[PDB]
Design a protein around this ligand. Sequence first.
Ligand SMILES: CNc1nc2cc3nc(NC)[nH]c3cc2c(=O)[nH]1
Ligand SMILES: CNc1nc2cc3nc(NC)[nH]c3cc2c(=O)[nH]1
Ligand SMILES: [Zn+2]
Ligand SMILES: [Zn+2]
Lengths: 368, 368
Amino acid sequence: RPRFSFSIAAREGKARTGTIEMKRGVIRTPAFMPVGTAATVKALKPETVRATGADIILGNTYHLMLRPGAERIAKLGGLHSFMGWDRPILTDSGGYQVMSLSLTKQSEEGVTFKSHSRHMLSPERSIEIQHLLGSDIVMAFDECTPYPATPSRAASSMERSMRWAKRSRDAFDSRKEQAENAALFGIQQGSVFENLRQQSADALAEIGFDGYAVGGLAVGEGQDEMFRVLDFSVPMLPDDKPHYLMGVGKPDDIVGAVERGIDMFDCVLPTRSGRNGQAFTWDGPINIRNARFSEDLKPLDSECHCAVCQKWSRAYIHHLIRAGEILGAMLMTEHNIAFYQQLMQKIRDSISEGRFSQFAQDFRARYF
Amino acid sequence: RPRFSFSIAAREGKARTGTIEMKRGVIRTPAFMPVGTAATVKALKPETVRATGADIILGNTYHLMLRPGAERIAKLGGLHSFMGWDRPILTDSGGYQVMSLSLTKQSEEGVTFKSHSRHMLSPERSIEIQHLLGSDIVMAFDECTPYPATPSRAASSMERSMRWAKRSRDAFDSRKEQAENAALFGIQQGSVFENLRQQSADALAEIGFDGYAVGGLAVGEGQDEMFRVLDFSVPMLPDDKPHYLMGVGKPDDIVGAVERGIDMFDCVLPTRSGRNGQAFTWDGPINIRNARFSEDLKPLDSECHCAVCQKWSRAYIHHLIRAGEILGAMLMTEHNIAFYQQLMQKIRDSISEGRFSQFAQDFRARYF
Ligand SMILES: CNc1nc2cc3nc(NC)[nH]c3cc2c(=O)[nH]1
Ligand SMILES: CNc1nc2cc3nc(NC)[nH]c3cc2c(=O)[nH]1
Ligand SMILES: [Zn+2]
Ligand SMILES: [Zn+2]
């Protein structure tokens, strides 16, 4: 395969469906990326992740650089080898988790922080850590602007991000092995302000990336406002490259985002809430800990093709979660990631068949 | 298959190898039974348990009767259906865990206790709970005599156990469906005293069971003393029925026990210590959390055929366990149960080939 090729096979409105071809495999778009925090998609073997239909996973740079360490993973052969996932891996650039999870000192150079011991991240180190991990899709080092932000603060933050975007580009390009085998995505910032989003889009396009993220959303603004910002922001991005909305989201968030032009998603919601007892169903989420499932012999979801729904009942999984059993986390997680992959498959198919608008409407009437 | 048929195919000294045929499957002996505490072998899907080579698992009556409940499991179709294990299940009779895990009041009728809310166990209720769970091999309700015990106390306790053994027999036999489809094992008691062991053996034989456990060991007496007691105790049991040593044990315990006539084993050591970071290897156990494995690319064990050793390194599993990741528990557990099944396979094969004595010696020189 090529280093990177994005092809759009079909369109409906702003929605697109297609493929990203990369050396380690093909990514069907719109894609959902299960999250591998610390070199594991929690409670799943990689074969199980693959079995659910995932084409690519995300790795968190912040966690990895702290434990087990990027240089160590490099010494051991790279993240793919280490965790046993041989398909593409997208790595985040680390700043978002630094600011939300670590003491910190921000500067034009980057950020120094204390592990939750003293560490540094900058455009150059971020890009080098992603290289050491052997990431397929490298994210530019950015600043996710807190919400709400005043226009002045949003602008200052966005401008720094665009300076860091150029630095990220140059660091990536300076490393031949990385530039020849990996892709680099830029991240748009600008909070909820259309002109700042535009300036950011322009800056990123002039630098040039393999793909473009819409950064700075799903940070407390709510779905209405996130959709409003996507409405004007995604058309600013190059049409012929993938559009990634990081940290999103609930099933309806994903559907609405695809309607507005997004091709890629990641979120911990299916894994984390699965361990928390929340199961996604076509009729909306259920909390399996609830007493009403204690004798319910139906599967988590009536239609789901996953192995969990083929084999075990709500009543059993209720018991496991109640009991704090590891197999409960395993089964809930497998189902929820399978459910997300089936959602993405239905989106892809409906776009390919020009019935996505109808799918979105049907999905919503039943889910709610 | 028959309800119950034990065949001995080969003998070496006191060791035997053969098969137990039951309606839900064949059990290769000497057998190791992974423990399913609360309707799950911790951190493993039942298919994974089967993949390691297990033919039968144990279920804990105490835990099940408390959560989710025996009657509830019965309503839902039985333990096999509930947890997704379609092969034989041996259920313990519950007293051992009552006395070690629950406030309690002991009487000739049985034991009342408070869940760790008020519950009762007796020969009759124990046998009924095992029926409700749909157990294949039912254990008589006994009293595991604490160690050390004076001869008087050992005798009093053993005598009660033998009265309870008769009550267990009669309760089992009174339930046609149970008597036609399940087997009943009696448990020998008597602490470390040869004459009490003999009286117990005699009592159990006169009642008549499908199999005989050596109860009251692995309760603090140490291997030397456990082997000494097995030396005289196992020959007292009927030769033509299975001999079960419950709660044993370490690999060397198992080897030594087979040398003395034991055909069946259960223990939490491979599962619990696996989650604790202890991995069994042919060169002895290792603690994977130790820093010396942080960059060790070898599998947990050099020879092990399990899927974990085919695919992941010590260094990765070290990281997972260090990080408290669920996949670490999963992988450690799968390896350790596979290791135990491979140990049992080597024992069976060596007995069948009349080289067990040599295997035991070789095993020991390398393991220690
Ligand atoms: C690593 N860079 C980076 N990560 C993010 C993670 C997010 N996660 C959410 N909601 C869960 N919004 C996010 C925005 C960004 C963002 O703008 N940039
Ligand atoms: C359920 N009846 C019953 N359980 C037991 C469990 C044991 N577990 C150990 N060591 C870990 N010894 C045991 C003895 C008995 C025993 O004599 N009887
Ligand atoms: Zn499912
Ligand atoms: Zn192994």
